[PDB]
Amino acid sequence: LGPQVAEGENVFGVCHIFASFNDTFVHVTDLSGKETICRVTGGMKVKADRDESSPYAAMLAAQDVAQRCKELGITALHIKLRATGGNRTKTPGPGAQSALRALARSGMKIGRIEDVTPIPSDSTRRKGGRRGRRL
């Protein structure tokens, strides 16, 4: 079922935290990244558009993710936090910090923390006009 090898050591996964300003993704996956353990977003925890990116929704999603990973044998997590990136914003959304803190607070062990938002060497045009969005 799970790795019951060397109970005294850590089993490491990778948590890809995608914190956009619309909602937040808490995605724990294999060490290589190909196999996924569980992905719980903030939108499957709140029934309203606005709170999809809220810190509370991210805390709930991270709690469920950590519960599933603990019941699946994974004990420690490497963090790969990303914002939307591209030509859009590079600042992580409101739920990133709360998701990370909820992962740490719910009995998970944190490994290396890395920021992986996609940064262009230079990009295509942004979705706004030349005068920007005026609201």
Binding site: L1, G2, P3, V5, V11, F12, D30, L31, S32, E35, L72, G73
Partner: peptide, 27 residues
């Protein structure tokens, strides 16, 4: 789908002091 998944050991090349770099899954 995780009841049909085996766990595997990932080994680093001999150039590195640490050999076992973690575990991985597959169906």
């Amino acid at each position: 789908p995780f009841s049909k998944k085996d766990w595997y050991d990932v080994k680093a090349p001999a150039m590195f002091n640490i050999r076992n770099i973690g575990k991985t899954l597959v169906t």
